[PDB]
């Protein structure tokens, strides 16, 4: 028993993690094949202030690229912008790049950092997509290019790559493609995040998780319908529920309907009323039911 916030292991990923500095900025890179793809705002004059990449860009030079791993040194051959990245040509392959594909996570759904400090991996932990895109972490300089990743069905999957912090302390990046999840810009910028909306699939899968612990105390004699949830989520900041097949083994296995879970999330946002639930003094929306499934039945 026990819930977790976990990550999946990291080794096939370590290997790819290099340093890339310009001029006066470091940060990471990730090395696949003969790419080493970064953070763009790795060659601007002044991350400081708002940056005309098309400026910078301009002015770059191939040979003032320092990327390094270890007593590994590689030279840069091309660079072009993707999105936000830098996709940087360089002259050696990674004789340990792993098979891999990119995809795109959504709002909702877990993945994990490889948090990874001036080319040095430092540390994994596990995230979980808000709905504006952000993630909350743990980033401070150095860590830009920080990789996320996810294994699913054997294949692993590149997903998130970081660049920023707003400033109400979310977590910003882009997918591979450099395409930045919620569209922010990779700007010093007191842009706004936007209203966060909890997700309710994951907060049902943090009650299922309590439980399978065998905590119990939140169920009332009391059952929610799914559209009237709904009609409910609309107006409080949770996401509809609009499919219950990822509960199916869960209610089968605790025998708790996912109604029952609707009826206790709408009483305890109001407040736990100094009462825990997995030692949580309120709702949860970081865990999957895939991930709680995994971790506390060890299937799927
Ligand atoms: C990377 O390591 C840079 O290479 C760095 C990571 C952040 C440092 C603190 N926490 C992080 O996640 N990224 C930055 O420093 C970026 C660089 C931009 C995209 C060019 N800047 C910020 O994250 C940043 C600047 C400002 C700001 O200014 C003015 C005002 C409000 C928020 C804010 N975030």
Redesign the pocket.
């Known amino acids: 028993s026990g819930l977790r916030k976990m990550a999946q292991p990291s080794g096939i990923v370590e290997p790819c993690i290099v340093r890339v500095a310009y001029g006066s900025?470091?940060?990471n890179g990730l090395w696949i094949g003969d790419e080493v793809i970064c953070?763009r705002?790795?060659i601007?004059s002044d991350?400081?202030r708002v940056?005309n990449y098309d400026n910078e860009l301009s002015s770059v030079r191939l040979h003032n690229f320092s990327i390094a791993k270890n007593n590994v040194f590689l030279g840069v051959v091309s660079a072009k912008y993707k999105g936000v990245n830098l996709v940087l040509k360089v002259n050696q392959v990674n004789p340990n790049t792993p098979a891999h594909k990119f995809k795109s996570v959504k709002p909702g759904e877990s993945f994990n950092i490889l948090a990874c400090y001036e080319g040095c991996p430092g540390s994994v932990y596990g995230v979980n997509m808000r709905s504006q895109g952000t993630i909350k972490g743990s980033?401070?300089?150095?860590?830009?290019?920080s990789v996320g990743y996810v294994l699913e069905n054997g294949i692993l999957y590149f997903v998130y790559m970081?660049?920023?912090?707003?400033?109400n302390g979310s977590?910003?990046g882009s997918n591979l493609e450099g395409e930045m999840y919620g569209g922010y810009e990779?700007?010093?910028?007191?842009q706004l995040e936007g209203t966060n909306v909890m997700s309710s699939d994951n907060v049902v899968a943090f009650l299922y998780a309590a439980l399978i612990n065998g905590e119990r105390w939140f169920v009332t004699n009391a059952s929610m319908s799914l559209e009237s949830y709904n009609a409910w989520a609309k107006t409080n900041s949770f996401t509809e529920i609009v499919s219950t097949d990822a509960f199916n083994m869960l209610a089968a296995k605790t025998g708790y309907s996912v109604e029952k879970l609707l009826e206790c999330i709408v009483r305890l946002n109001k407040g736990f009323g100094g009462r825990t639930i997995l030692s949580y003094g309120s709702l949860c929306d970081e865990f999957t039911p895939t991930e709680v499934i995994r971790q506390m039945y060890g299937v799927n």
């Open positions: 900025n470091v940060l953070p705002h790795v601007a991350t400081s940056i980033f401070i300089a150095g860590t830009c290019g970081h660049h920023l912090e707003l400033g977590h910003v990779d700007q010093p910028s007191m």
